[model samples]
Target: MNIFEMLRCDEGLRLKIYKDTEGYYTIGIGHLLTKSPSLNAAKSELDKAIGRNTNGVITKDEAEKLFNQDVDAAVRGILRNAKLKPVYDSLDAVRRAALINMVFQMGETGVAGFTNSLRMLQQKRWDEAAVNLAKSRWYNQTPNRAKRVITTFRTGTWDAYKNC
Candidate 1:
């Protein structure tokens, strides 16, 4: 799964996926209206883009234009059914969903950055998982946003990460 997919497709995230001039689907665009995807999820989404994009300097229009294609594929892939199960099979639904969000924003290589986080979750090391999540430079992108999601995942409180 990828980050854009997670953000664009997840009913809970409330992020609007848009196309850019380059034709990719971008997830975050500063102060967009959304709810219930965790402060971390929201922040992480923006962080992922910031990391993938040009150092948090990209314009909203540019992001929307460039990411159109990627966003479309990600958002519709799960619903349309594709041979991409190799990625999905490796993760639990929640993790897979989260990874999808990450991948969507960061691309495959970017999503791979979460290897440690995945490993921690696989070991069921809940506390360490949250800490590891916050340990990334990306987590520090906007302070409490990423922390919100990390905390929710570790504590098993999906309210902040869920839509309803």
Candidate 2:
């Protein structure tokens, strides 16, 4: 398999806050609390992840830098498919954001493999796109987050589960 598949197999996927074997707070693939944004940014995320957000350990600007970098990579990866551009460009802001989020979670190849969902999106069948997305293994792996993204596809608006 590819490096990403290997990492997924080695690290495993996680959606919620949990302590790693070494005791670092972690979420989403193997992202460590002490490895986000910057040095203290890790503590900031860890605190927020574990439900203790009283201390301002990280600024929104610092956090957003990480977000922007991730989203930018995902977007760049997805944009490699010229054939997808027309359909991607046709989507509204929220729907586009949903796709970007999916790309971040599943990678461009995984998202591209969702033939039925992509077809539905290309056809502008919003509801069908959501349903097709829900039928994927990715949805099964992360149901709560998938549901919110599918809702975006269905309603053309943004919605998300309570987690970072």
Candidate 3:
């Protein structure tokens, strides 16, 4: 196989957010989350790609380039779907990170379906959001990670989900 094809087998291709082997939020073929230099670099590239401070949708070519060049940034962009929202930003850092992390795995639309949870969060109802999160389908898929994120949302502390 060609190198790209070979890599695809190992990395897997995705058009949306999903958990990586290590359980970090990832998207578009192996772009892992947080603490990665590539993630930051991808963000910078995306800013440049779409023109900083401008409003427009990215073309397929542009998105493909982004996915190929920096999956991490693409993942970051997905995370920003929640991160950049005014209501999401109103949350504390821990809670914000928790929501973004879930968005990374669930995609913006999927996350949005948690209307009650999002509403509670927008209202700064951390306890309610946390409780609702534990009752979500996402929680069913990754209960261990949900425990840590929900706990952090509830308590506003940096709790790590160790076992994937």
In terms of lDDT, which candidate is strongest?
2
Which residue pairs of candidate 2 clash? Answer: none
Q: Is candidate 2 or candidate 3 better by lDDT?
A: 2
Clashes of each: 28, 0, 0
Give residue 39's error in model 1 in angstroms.
Answer: 30
Per residue, candidate 3 scores C-alpha lDDT tens digits across 12-33 of 5664444575455454545543
Q: Which residue runs does candidate 3 get wrong by more than 4 Å? A: 1-84, 161-164
| Stretches of candidate 1 exceeding 4 Å from the true structure | 1-90, 155-157, 162-164
Predicted candidate 2 versus true structure: per-residue lDDT over 1-164, tens digit per residue: 22233234335555455566545555555555663435356556656654666243444444444444556777788778765566578887767777776777666777778877888897889887887788877678767667877876788743342232
lDDT against the true structure, per candidate, is 0.50, 0.63, 0.57
lDDT of 1 by residue, 1-164 (tens): 23443344332221354433234333443223124345454445555644553433455565554456555565455344333334455545565555445445445555455777767766668798788878787677634446545655566444444442
Q: Which ten contiguous residues of candidate 3 have the minimum total lDDT?
A: 1-10
Distance from true position, residue 60, model 3, in Å? 27
**Lowest lDDT 10-residue stretch of candidate 1:** 5-14
Question: Which ranges of candidate 2 are over 4 A from the true structure?
Answer: 1-64, 159-164
1 against 3, candidate with superior TM-score: 3
* Per-prediction TM-score: 0.46, 0.60, 0.51
Ranking by TM-score: 2, 3, 1
lDDT accuracy of residue 127 in candidate 3: 82
- The 10-residue segment with the lowest total lDDT in model 2: 1-10
